[PDB]
């Protein structure tokens, strides 16, 4: 890979009439997938990260919003980043989005981190747009290459032994962090079980304990579940994504859990802000929110 | 170390994000 050339081309569309594509060659994109897979597999499936860093939720192919996030947060490696999954689907430029993220992972592997979301799954992104985008601009074989890459993404992260991060939420199957560590990669996301729950579950204020999730996949969990999880694992905060929230961030269970969502005006249907959470060296958390405007 | 939260949120407005 010539990673510098790739990043330069991805970044040079800044300020262009939004919607403008970057057409990397097929072999460069394949290259990003192959090299990032190597990096993902060589690093832990449960990341151990140190603050300061910036944490973002769902991007969903909103490439020009991703560029704005970097403009406000600082371009790598000026700031460290942890993304919480859902890079593709339901947006207009998933290819550019995932290519820039993989490129940054390759260039700054210890300053830049990506977790797996429920859309980083062939069965989901075949339907919700990514497959169609790949087919239109390249071919099926490239989409399949992406799936092999996604199957190797890490699943969760712990920041300074105090903040537990994952895309979806908790699992009633989860008793020790070691269970996450013993998940072998590459793997698909199962229709049920621990890995499914980590990518699909949701907090719910009206559930006591665990409940069946209205989505029809995985579970909901209540505030006392969060409290017991934190107490058991000596943690202060759960940081997750996976739900559109009006201000881009939303607290649950007296600030013991936070939901982050980083795609403003998602699907052009919600009028939600996108948020980015900064965690300083002392673990003070602050929020920057991108509010959509006419 | 202990997680704490800054009360002050920084807000930005992104023109063009309605009706992309
Ligand atoms: Mn999502
Ligand atoms: Mn999701």
Residue numbers in the entry:
A (entry chain J): 7 to 300
B (entry chain K): 639 to 658
Paper text:
Stable ternary complexes were formed by incubating G-actin (purified from rabbit muscle) with bacterially-expressed [GST-PPP1R15 and PP1G] binary complexes immobilized on a glutathione sepharose resin. Crystals of ternary complexes containing either PPP1R15A or PPP1R15B were obtained, but only the PPP1R15B-containing crystals diffracted X-rays and that to a resolution of only 7.9 Å. PP1 and actin assemble to form an elongated flat object. The C-terminal structured portion of PPP1R15B faces lobe IV of actin, suggesting that the portion of the regulatory subunit C-terminal of W662 that is unstructured in the binary complex is poised to interact with actin and bridge the gap between actin and PP1. Whilst the resolution of the ternary complex is insufficient to trace the regulatory subunit's trajectory beyond that defined by the higher resolution binary complexes (i.e., C-terminal to W662), the most significant feature in the averaged difference density map is observed in the cleft between domains I and III in actin's barbed end; suggesting that PPP1R15B extends to engage this site and providing a plausible explanation for the inhibitory effect of cytochalasin D on eIF2aP dephosphorylation by the ternary complex. The C terminal-most residues of the PPP1R15 functional core (F696-Q700 in human PPP1R15B and W609-R613 in mouse PPP1R15A) are good candidates for mediating this interaction. This portion of PPP1R15 proteins can be modeled to form an amphipathic helix, which is found in other G-actin barbed end-binding proteins, exemplified by the drosophila Ciboulot helix. And deletion of this portion abrogates actin-mediated acceleration of eIF2aP dephosphorylation in vitro. In the ternary complex of PPP1R15-PP1-actin, the active site (of the catalytic subunit) is positioned at the bottom of a shallow platform constituted by actin and PP1. The N-terminal lobe, containing the phosphorylated residue of eIF2a, can be computationally docked into this composite surface, bringing phospho-S51 in contact with the catalytic site.
In animal cells, eIF2a phosphorylation is reversed by cellular phosphatase complexes consisting of a protein phosphatase 1 catalytic subunit (PP1) and a substrate-specific regulatory subunit. An RVxF motif, common to many PP1 binding proteins, is present in the conserved functional core of the PPP1R15 family members and their viral counterparts, and plays an important role in assembly of the active holophosphatase complex. Our studies reveal the essential role of a third cellular factor, G-actin, in endowing the complex with substrate specificity and provide the first glimpse at the structure of a ternary holophosphatase complex possessing such substrate specificity.
